[PDB]
Amino acid sequence: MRPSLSDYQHVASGKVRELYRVDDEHLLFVATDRISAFDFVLDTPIPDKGRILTAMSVFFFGLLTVPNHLAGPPDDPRIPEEVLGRALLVRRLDMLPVECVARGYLTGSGLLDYQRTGAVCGHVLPQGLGEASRLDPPLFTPATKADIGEHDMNVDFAAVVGLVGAVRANQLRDETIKIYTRAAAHALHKGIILADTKFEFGVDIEGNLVLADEVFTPDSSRYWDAAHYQPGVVQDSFDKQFVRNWLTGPESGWDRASDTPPPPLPDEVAVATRERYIEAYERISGLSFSDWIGP
Ligand SMILES: CCOC(=O)Cn1cc(-c2ncnc(N)c2C#N)cn1
């Protein structure tokens, strides 16, 4: 018999994920079906999104050879029935206060920083780059979390040194770029560009660096369709473009420049979005989502 979620102490909530204490050395890392668009958590959940993203993360943890925080299988008996398939048993780490971002392509705040200054996180880039330009080598573009309201703040390597130590900063940079490169090549071979990605790391009792949080989900990474990659214009979000298009289209009745909370999504947009997540997962993993565990 699996424990109830109510048997565990809630210790943290994010926009779409939750964290629970299991015991002194383990946590329960829970994905919900919530989806964020335009910095709003939307009213409408995407069915099975939590399970699909958990499956994705587990696949990539298995693909990478680096130590990670997984502490049991996806069907570990410590996982409650209610969150089966969308929750992982993980080792408690001392988390390092750095958002470890790799960018293989120039978009979002990386592009904006470049357009304003010619540089991103201390990297002075070639002239003539633009939206969705390929970066080679990939850039380490670290960030720090800001207040409840603001977006993460881009920082340079010196800031990372000041946060975690000189040798540790080098390690974060090198590991971030190495594992991004591996995952990006894998995905591209399957027809998906991972344009960028965000990692969090922690340290275990021995001082070892351990990859944590979630890895290479479409929430932590920009997924693009490689078959439609066209430098110079904004690439469609593989998973979220239907949501984006509807919210900013003629049917929603919502003005994005209002910063008022957006309206609920049509059921068929939510179902279509679920299908995009499943397609991304199956293409990348070579596995069938119908085989992924659930309640
Ligand atoms: C609610 C969603 O936000 C987070 O979970 C971010 N976060 C992660 C930790 C963490 N803390 C100790 N050990 C870990 N293995 C982890 C992980 N993953 C804390 N906040």
From Swiss-Prot:
The protein's Enzyme Commission number:
6.3.2.6
Any single biological process term in GO: 'de novo' IMP biosynthetic process
Alphabetical keyword list: ATP-binding, Ligase, Nucleotide-binding, Purine biosynthesis
What SUPFAM superfamilies does the record tag this protein with?
Answer: SAICAR synthase-like (SSF56104)
PROSITE patterns named among the record's database cross-references:
SAICAR_SYNTHETASE_1 (PS01057), SAICAR_SYNTHETASE_2 (PS01058)
| A GO term from the CC aspect | cytoplasm
What is the top EC class of this enzyme, as a single word?
A: ligase
Q: Which Gene3D superfamilies does the entry mention?
A: ATP-grasp fold, B domain (3.30.470.20), Phosphorylase Kinase, domain 1 (3.30.200.20)
Membrane-crossing residues?
none
- What InterPro entries is this protein classified in? SAICAR_synt/ADE2_N (IPR028923), SAICAR_synth (IPR001636), SAICAR_synthetase_CS (IPR018236)
Under catalytic activity, the entry for this protein gives:
5-amino-1-(5-phospho-D-ribosyl)imidazole-4-carboxylate + L-aspartate + ATP = (2S)-2-[5-amino-1-(5-phospho-beta-D-ribosyl)imidazole-4-carboxamido]succinate + ADP + phosphate + 2 H(+)
Task: Output one GO MF annotation.
Answer: phosphoribosylaminoimidazolesuccinocarboxamide synthase activity
Q: Name one Pfam family in it.
A: SAICAR_synt
Q: Is Signal there in the keyword field?
A: no
Task: Tell me the pathway.
Answer: Purine metabolism; IMP biosynthesis via de novo pathway; 5-amino-1-(5-phospho-D-ribosyl)imidazole-4-carboxamide from 5-amino-1-(5-phospho-D-ribosyl)imidazole-4-carboxylate: step 1/2
PANTHER family recorded: PHOSPHORIBOSYLAMINOIMIDAZOLE-SUCCINOCARBOXAMIDE SYNTHASE
Q: Which family does it belong to?
A: Belongs to the SAICAR synthetase family.
UniProt-recorded name of the protein: Phosphoribosylaminoimidazole-succinocarboxamide synthase
